[PDB]
Write an enzyme that holds these catalytic residues in place. Structure first.
Site, mmCIF file in Angstrom:
data_model
loop_
_atom_site.group_PDB
_atom_site.id
_atom_site.type_symbol
_atom_site.label_atom_id
_atom_site.label_comp_id
_atom_site.label_asym_id
_atom_site.label_seq_id
_atom_site.Cartn_x
_atom_site.Cartn_y
_atom_site.Cartn_z
ATOM 1 N N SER A 160 -73.964 -15.542 6.441
ATOM 2 C CA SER A 160 -74.788 -15.192 5.289
ATOM 3 C C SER A 160 -75.092 -16.351 4.338
ATOM 4 O O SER A 160 -74.206 -17.171 4.055
ATOM 5 C CB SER A 160 -74.158 -14.030 4.525
ATOM 6 O OG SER A 160 -74.429 -12.789 5.150
ATOM 7 N N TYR A 212 -86.234 -8.396 3.743
ATOM 8 C CA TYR A 212 -85.112 -9.118 4.346
ATOM 9 C C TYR A 212 -84.340 -8.145 5.217
ATOM 10 O O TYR A 212 -84.181 -8.407 6.395
ATOM 11 C CB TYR A 212 -84.210 -9.644 3.217
ATOM 12 C CG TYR A 212 -82.925 -10.324 3.635
ATOM 13 C CD1 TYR A 212 -81.742 -9.599 3.776
ATOM 14 C CD2 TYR A 212 -82.852 -11.711 3.740
ATOM 15 C CE1 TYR A 212 -80.539 -10.230 4.108
ATOM 16 C CE2 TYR A 212 -81.653 -12.355 4.056
ATOM 17 C CZ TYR A 212 -80.497 -11.612 4.255
ATOM 18 O OH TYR A 212 -79.311 -12.259 4.578
ATOM 19 N N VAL A 213 -83.873 -7.015 4.635
ATOM 20 C CA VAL A 213 -83.119 -5.936 5.295
ATOM 21 C C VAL A 213 -83.855 -5.508 6.552
ATOM 22 O O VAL A 213 -83.273 -5.553 7.638
ATOM 23 C CB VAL A 213 -82.833 -4.724 4.357
ATOM 24 C CG1 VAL A 213 -82.062 -3.619 5.072
ATOM 25 C CG2 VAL A 213 -82.098 -5.158 3.101
ATOM 26 N N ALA A 236 -86.237 -6.991 8.290
ATOM 27 C CA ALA A 236 -86.347 -8.100 9.237
ATOM 28 C C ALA A 236 -85.042 -8.393 9.984
ATOM 29 O O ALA A 236 -85.088 -8.776 11.154
ATOM 30 C CB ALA A 236 -86.832 -9.341 8.526
ATOM 31 N N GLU A 286 -72.948 0.220 5.301
ATOM 32 C CA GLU A 286 -73.233 1.596 4.876
ATOM 33 C C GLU A 286 -74.443 2.207 5.567
ATOM 34 O O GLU A 286 -74.395 3.388 5.912
ATOM 35 C CB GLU A 286 -73.349 1.691 3.347
ATOM 36 C CG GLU A 286 -73.380 3.114 2.803
ATOM 37 C CD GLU A 286 -73.159 3.301 1.311
ATOM 38 O OE1 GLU A 286 -73.010 4.473 0.891
ATOM 39 O OE2 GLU A 286 -73.130 2.292 0.567
ATOM 40 N N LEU A 287 -75.515 1.409 5.783
ATOM 41 C CA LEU A 287 -76.733 1.874 6.459
ATOM 42 C C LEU A 287 -76.363 2.286 7.886
ATOM 43 O O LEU A 287 -76.781 3.337 8.372
ATOM 44 C CB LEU A 287 -77.782 0.750 6.501
ATOM 45 C CG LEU A 287 -79.255 1.126 6.388
ATOM 46 C CD1 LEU A 287 -80.122 -0.113 6.238
ATOM 47 C CD2 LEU A 287 -79.748 1.948 7.545
#
EC number: 2.3.2.22
Length: 220
Positions: free
Chosen positions: A27, A165-166, A168, A194-195
């Site tokens: 990250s 971003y998420v 992609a 969590e997703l």
């Protein structure tokens, strides 16, 4: 060996057992993904698995800096500087492992013109616009992403931009196999997702592939 491994599903443990391939997710602008740590996870991947890949942040990382009040040019400069720094550390560790660097490190921006990534990205964006619950789940992740990179304001408009971003990054979490060309693989990170929990509890019209997992690495 020096890492406590947790699993999103039972199937993730089954995939893990087989030790075919792992994706180490590194990250940007985060305190954890420091030279010391990045090395640790590579040595770990290298020692336990048949093969590994590294996934670094894509171009859409500018969006997160723009939401933290950065000029579109200043954001692209900070993104480039970080990714090059990450690449240099990663390449150094891969050599120490007597492994080739070629096609080992990727960005989620690298497969923009890949038919398999194009398909998965579309299917995800369709749900983001149609499914209201999924849109919210994405924005929650966008909100956490903005917090986690808080080293140097928030509105619902801010979160829809940061969600790019998420969206992609997501194709590598659901089915990275036909994109990076693996039989089966695990996306390895330091925190839960969590997703993903919600994806796994069939709360959306999206599914994480049977040949795809998610593991949580905690330092021992």
């Amino acid at each position: 060996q020096n890492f406590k491994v947790d699993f999103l599903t039972k199937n993730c443990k089954q995939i893990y057992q087989r030790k075919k391939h792992v994706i180490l997710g590194i990250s940007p602008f985060t305190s954890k993904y420091n030279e010391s740590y990045i090395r640790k996870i590579i040595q770990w991947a290298n020692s336990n698995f048949d093969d590994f890949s590294i996934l670094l942040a894509g171009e859409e990382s500018k969006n997160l800096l723009e939401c933290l009040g950065y000029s579109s040019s200043k954001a692209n400069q900070k993104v480039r500087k970080e990714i090059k720094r990450q690449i240099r550390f990663c390449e150094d560790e891969i050599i120490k492992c007597n492994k080739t660097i070629t096609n080992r490190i990727h960005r989620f921006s690298d497969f923009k013109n890949n038919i398999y990534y194009i398909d998965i990205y579309k299917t995800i964006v369709d749900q983001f616009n149609t499914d209201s619950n999924f849109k919210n789940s994405c924005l929650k992740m966008s909100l956490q992403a903005l917090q986690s990179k808080g080293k140097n304001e928030i509105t619902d408009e801010t979160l829809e931009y940061a969600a790019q971003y998420v969206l992609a990054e997501l194709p590598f979490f659901l089915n990275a196999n036909p994109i990076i060309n693996t039989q089966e693989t695990l996306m390895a990170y330091h925190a839960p997702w969590e997703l993903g929990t919600n994806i796994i509890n069939d709360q959306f019209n999206l599914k994480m592939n049977e040949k795809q997992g998610y593991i949580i690495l905690t330092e021992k």
